[PDB]
Amino acid sequence: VKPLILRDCSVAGWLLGNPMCDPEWSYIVEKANPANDLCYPGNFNDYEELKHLLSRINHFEKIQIIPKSSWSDHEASSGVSSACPYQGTPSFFRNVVWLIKKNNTYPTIKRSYNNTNQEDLLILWGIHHSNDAAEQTKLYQNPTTYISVGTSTLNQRLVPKIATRSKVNGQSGRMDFFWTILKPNDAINFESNGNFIAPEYAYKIVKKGDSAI
Ligand SMILES: *[C@@H]1O[C@H](CO)[C@@H](O)[C@H](O)[C@H]1NC(C)=O
Ligand SMILES: *[C@@H]1O[C@H](CO)[C@@H](O)[C@H](O)[C@H]1NC(C)=O
Numbered sequence: 161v162k163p164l165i166l167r168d169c170s171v172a173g174w175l176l177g178n179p180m181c182d183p184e185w186s187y188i189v190e191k192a193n194p195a196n197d198l199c200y201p202g203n204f205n206d207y208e209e210l211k212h213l214l215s216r217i218n219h220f221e222k223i224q225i226i227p228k229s230s231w232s233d234h235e236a237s238s239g240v241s242s243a244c245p246y247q248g249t250p251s252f253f254r255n256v257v258w259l260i261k262k263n264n265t266y267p268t269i270k271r272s273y274n275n276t277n278q279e280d281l282l283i284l285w286g287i288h289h290s291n292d293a294a295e296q297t298k299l300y301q302n303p304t305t306y307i308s309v310g311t312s313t314l315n316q317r318l319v320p321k322i323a324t325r326s327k328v329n330g331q332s333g334r335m336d337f338f339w340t341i342l343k344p345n346d347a348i349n350f351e352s353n354g355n356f357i358a359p360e361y362a363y364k365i366v367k368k369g370d371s372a373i
Pocket of ligand 1: 263
């Protein structure tokens, strides 16, 4: 088990799986000025807090918590962007899922994940802010949407801000990302009818000082 030494990628970029960045590690090292952060424009919530938390971790393990194959009623591989290319073609963050309507329908999602592991889990998700009613319809069908997220300590409801915006890295849309630490035997619960960038992979983390000798 070796340290994870990020070359061209930020902490946020690696966690989310920025495709422009070329299973188990100890601590993480991030360079001073990584070229690749968030390829798609937007915000990473409480980023300073996450970086400090992650600097205190010396065991990481990436686990699949919501398999991409489990989205039977939503497209899970159709959402890509020229902001996030791979080998010259539009791509997307690899560790979260851009869910898109399927057959002109976006059923309301209810998904829970229960932390059956012995370690704390870092889980990330996001929201896509669309540019106008037409784009909203095209991608998600439903005009008025939300993402609700709950744990034993988190109670969040995200609502897209649908508005015309300047193009940043070619995109008028924005994506904001959020995270939490899910304690053992706690569960995270999602309900959404659109604009949801869903977790696929999460990270088991152990703080320095918490391991057996
Ligand atoms: C798509 O939705 C329509 C409307 O309900 C339905 O009639 C049709 O069978 C659906 N097609 C597929 C392939 O699910
Ligand atoms: C997680 O699963 C365990 C085992 O089934 C259960 O006892 C516990 O209530 C679940 N946690 C939550 C928050 O539902």
